[PDB]
Amino acid sequence: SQTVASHVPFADLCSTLERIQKSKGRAEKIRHFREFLDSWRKFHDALHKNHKDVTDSFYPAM
Amino acid sequence: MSGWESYYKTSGRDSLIFLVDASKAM
Amino acid sequence: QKGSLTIQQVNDLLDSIASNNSAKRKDLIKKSLLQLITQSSALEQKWLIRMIIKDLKLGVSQQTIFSVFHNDAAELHNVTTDLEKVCRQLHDPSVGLSDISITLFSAFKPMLAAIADIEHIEKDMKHQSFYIETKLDGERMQMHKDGDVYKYFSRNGYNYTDQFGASPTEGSLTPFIHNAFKADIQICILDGEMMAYNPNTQTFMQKGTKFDIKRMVEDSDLQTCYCVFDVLMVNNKKLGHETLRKRYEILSSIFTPIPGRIEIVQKTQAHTKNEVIDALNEAIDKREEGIMVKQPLSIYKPDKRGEGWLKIKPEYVSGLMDELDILIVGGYWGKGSRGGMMSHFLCAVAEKPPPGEKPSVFHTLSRVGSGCTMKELYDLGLKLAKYWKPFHRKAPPSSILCGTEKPEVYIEPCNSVIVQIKAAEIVPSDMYKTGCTLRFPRIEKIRDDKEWHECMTLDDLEQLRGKASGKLASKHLYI
Amino acid sequence: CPGESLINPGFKSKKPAGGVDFD
Amino acid sequence: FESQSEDELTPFDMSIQCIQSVYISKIISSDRDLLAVVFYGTEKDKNSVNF
């Protein structure tokens, strides 16, 4: 029962949140959040390549 | 697996305010 | 300078904290917090504190986050109110959801109502007939029923089934309302208000702030009542896309009301502004919150305000309320957005002095901290900055008399300012010297023309309290 | 403070017994 | 754990002797006092904070 949240340091999420907070416009904030989300999704795809039924999701970060 | 380290990789108008000095010297 | 925690570990520790709080074990909370402190950096701990307090202040709307996550995520959350389902179902951006609608045992954000200006009421109803009903003073609840299983959800989605009962064997409402439903109804979703009912007088007790309909007391005589004003699902038939007329019609074929425990709110047809004004005046006569106006051909739209539902209260109409001129006797410091300034204040009424003398003693009435812009607050702080004094509980001042609520800094009445307060009503309280406190207080104007010795007096406050049973809206709208 | 015991705080360090020391 | 001279006590041995002497003195003099022994610089760990 592998989970992506078991591989993601909390420091990465904290740094992303700090960058979002210390940004001027909506574009930059959305950009940082989107970068984090895309990295998470790509890692999810890599990790669960063989498994069939997966309950993993973005919930731990959301 | 390559690990999480690989995937993350870490108009307008002008305003002017004159400021004169009302001292005895001036 | 570096941490060693993953997201899963943090979630596990927070889960331990919550569960151990539920089980009344503080040692485990201390242990979990100690582990978090020892295995985290300063930045991580700042963000953990923000998450625990449940305020992040990212500056980006929740709607923006949902829109970035998936094209249809806010829509799904308005129907499920569960982040887990949103994140699991909407994992692949390309793959969407065919149809999203209210489902059994899934909380949905209730439909709300928008303020109405009585003049254009007809224009808001598209020049057609509309429904007028009374506004009830209680909690908002939604009930899901499947056979013998019941579930209850609050306005924001919090589960309340423990209080009201998940089965006819237990609860405060279910054992009595189970038999109200008709033979053919097994699946049902209802939306309504939860109220307190006194059987001796057979009257609804308005939950201004007291007698805890939020948590009924066993020894109390009053009981819990459910006033239903909507149906959204009956026997695998979804009614959320139907008109209000059809739902109101169907609502009479689900349960046969038994007074005191479950009821249907009465809706009256009306097609003129004068009818609305008459209903509002009648509500003021009966000492009620206000009225609601609804459009018969309006569908249900979760989490949406000002679509088909409107509300009118005496406060929204100018001039219909009594306002109180009271003094500022103390102040408090503010939170983030307004940090280095006095944001909320403690006000007091005067004591009728001997004839031909200025007032000497004062009695606290209530705190007020809303209704002033930032500039007004800055100016007020500058005016009263010199006269603030620290408050010591051991040596309270003679001029100001306080109850259980005490200010951080107090100012002598001779150097303070008069403030106008608009409040819904006056209610008994034990935290203030006057024995009463305002409901929904706000500042209407900092009067620069009134002296400190022109403040209200306990006699005037008592007269106002007794004039209209405490409600500050007494007279009738005229046109 | 001066000449205090490092084993029992609050007590003065007793000098060791010396017996008879003839002058 | 190093002895500068062949006939001399290592710092560790001196520390342990002192600890034992204080323990015996406390037993005889004040038996209701509290004493504890901790080590730092080791490879293993045993503490509440899991340091």
Ligand SMILES: *OP(=O)(O)OC[C@H]1O[C@@H](n2cnc3c(N)ncnc32)[C@H](O)[C@@H]1O
């Ligand atoms: O002021 P507000 O936004 O809380 O008002 C809306 C709330 O009013 C309550 N309420 C009482 N009676 C009704 C009817 N008949 N219809 C809709 N809402 C009603 C609800 O608690 C609602 O959230």
Ligand SMILES: [Mg+2]
């Ligand atoms: Mg209400």
